[PDB]
Design an enzyme around this catalytic site. Structure first.
Site, PDB file in Angstrom:
ATOM      1  N   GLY A  15       0.815  -1.224   0.000  1.00 57.49           N
ATOM      2  CA  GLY A  15       0.000   0.000   0.000  1.00 57.49           C
ATOM      3  C   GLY A  15       0.840   1.261   0.000  1.00 57.49           C
ATOM      4  N   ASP A 125      -7.641   9.014  15.097  1.00 56.17           N
ATOM      5  CA  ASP A 125      -8.016   8.848  13.678  1.00 56.17           C
ATOM      6  C   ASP A 125      -8.648   7.478  13.472  1.00 56.17           C
ATOM      7  OD1 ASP A 125      -5.266  10.281  13.813  1.00 56.17           O
ATOM      8  OD2 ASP A 125      -6.266  11.181  12.093  1.00 56.17           O
ATOM      9  N   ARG A 129     -10.622   2.648   7.433  1.00 58.12           N
ATOM     10  CA  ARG A 129      -9.434   2.803   6.591  1.00 58.12           C
ATOM     11  C   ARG A 129      -8.170   2.575   7.448  1.00 58.12           C
ATOM     12  NH1 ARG A 129     -11.435   7.819   7.186  1.00 58.12           N
ATOM     13  NH2 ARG A 129     -10.208   9.087   8.592  1.00 58.12           N
ATOM     14  N   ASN A 130      -8.243   2.652   8.764  1.00 56.82           N
ATOM     15  CA  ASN A 130      -7.076   2.507   9.685  1.00 56.82           C
ATOM     16  C   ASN A 130      -7.247   1.265  10.540  1.00 56.82           C
ATOM     17  OD1 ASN A 130      -5.773   4.768   8.714  1.00 56.82           O
ATOM     18  ND2 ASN A 130      -6.908   6.158  10.070  1.00 56.82           N
ATOM     19  N   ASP A 143      -2.196   2.379  13.204  1.00 56.57           N
ATOM     20  CA  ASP A 143      -1.860   3.804  12.970  1.00 56.57           C
ATOM     21  C   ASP A 143      -2.445   4.649  14.098  1.00 56.57           C
ATOM     22  OD1 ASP A 143      -0.140   3.696  10.780  1.00 56.57           O
ATOM     23  OD2 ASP A 143      -1.730   3.600   9.259  1.00 56.57           O
TER      24      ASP A 143
END
Ligand code: L9S
Length: 263
Positions: A15, A125, A129-130, A143
């Protein structure tokens, strides 16, 4: 904490993003690792390095394991998660997920967040997506904390063009009031992402319109696959008043109870 980059064998790209490139690799010929290669100038690297010590002591089975850092150059070495990004995972309609599977991904995430909350550590966050997915279909949180070292102000300020408006409570959008309860809000949006099979939150809105909507009391509405009881849990994360939002301990208890009931 320090890994010799010489002990790394690079094998495949996993990625690319604004802050880095992640490659699949081996450590000392044998052990699977993800190697996060930080792009020069994206990150406050000397601040990160001192932080990596408190992060090296964060360890939980639902938290992507940090192995170490390569800081004589800069690389972050983490647990390899063979099924990759949770958002991509959710959008693959081939999995034909049972709702029991969706609730288990919520629990994996909630267990990680309960641990972080226990350590007074904010993700900052939290979003599909994380999250990553391993070879056994287990979801883990990734993350966490790293946005604090991002140098691009379009990502880090609330008024920024790459800020996670759709995972932010009104006190964050209005006043930059970050807390355990902005993570609780984010978590609610994540449960929505899971039960919507990876739809964008506020699909028909801009970030500007999302912020105006949230401010007036508009909320995400019930995904088709969410039972009334599951919806009650995600909606509890979105109280206007931060102090009326649950803890992650209370959310994990709520998810477990619905697992037993099967809503
Ligand atoms: O750039 C990242 N992470 C990153 C970069 C590129 C790719 C991936 C994952 C990597 N993917 C993986 N596949 C399998 N096993 C894995 N283990 C670890 C990652 C990974 C496969 C899926 N990829 C998603 C892309 O399709 C992540 N983190 C970050 C940072 F270094 C510096 C400052 C801030 C941050 N945070 C701030 C908030 C968001 C980013």
């Amino acid at each position: 904490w320090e890994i010799d980059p010489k002990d790394l064998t690079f094998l495949k790209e996993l990625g690319t993003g604004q802050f880095g490139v992640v490659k699949y690799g081996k450590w000392r010929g044998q052990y699977d690792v993800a190697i996060k290669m930080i792009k020069e100038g994206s990150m406050s690297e000397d601040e990160f390095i001192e932080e990596a010590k408190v992060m090296m002591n964060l360890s939980h089975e639902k938290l992507v394991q940090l192995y170490g850092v390569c800081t004589k150059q800069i690389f972050i070495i983490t647990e390899y998660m063979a099924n990759g990004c949770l958002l991509n995972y959710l959008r693959e309609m081939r999995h034909r997920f049972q709702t029991q599977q969706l609730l288990e991904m919520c629990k994996d995430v909630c267990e990680a967040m309960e641990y972080l909350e226990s350590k007074q550590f904010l993700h900052r966050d939290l979003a599909a997506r994380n999250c990553l997915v391993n070879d056994q279909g287990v979801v883990k949180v990734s993350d966490f904390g790293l946005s604090r070292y991002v140098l691009d102000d379009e990502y880090t300020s609330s008024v920024g063009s790459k800020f996670p408006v759709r995972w932010s409570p009104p006190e964050v959008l209005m006043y930059s009031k970050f807390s355990s309860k902005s993570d609780i809000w984010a978590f609610g949006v994540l449960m929505w992402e899971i039960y919507s099979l990876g739809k964008m939150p506020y699909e028909r809105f801009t970030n500007s319109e999302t912020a105006e909507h949230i401010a007036q009391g508009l909320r995400l509405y019930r995904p088709h696959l969410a039972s009334e009881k599951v919806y009650t849990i995600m909606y509890s994360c979105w109280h206007e008043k931060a102090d009326e939002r649950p803890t992650f301990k209370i959310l994990l208890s709520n998810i477990l109870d619905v697992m037993d009931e099967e809503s």
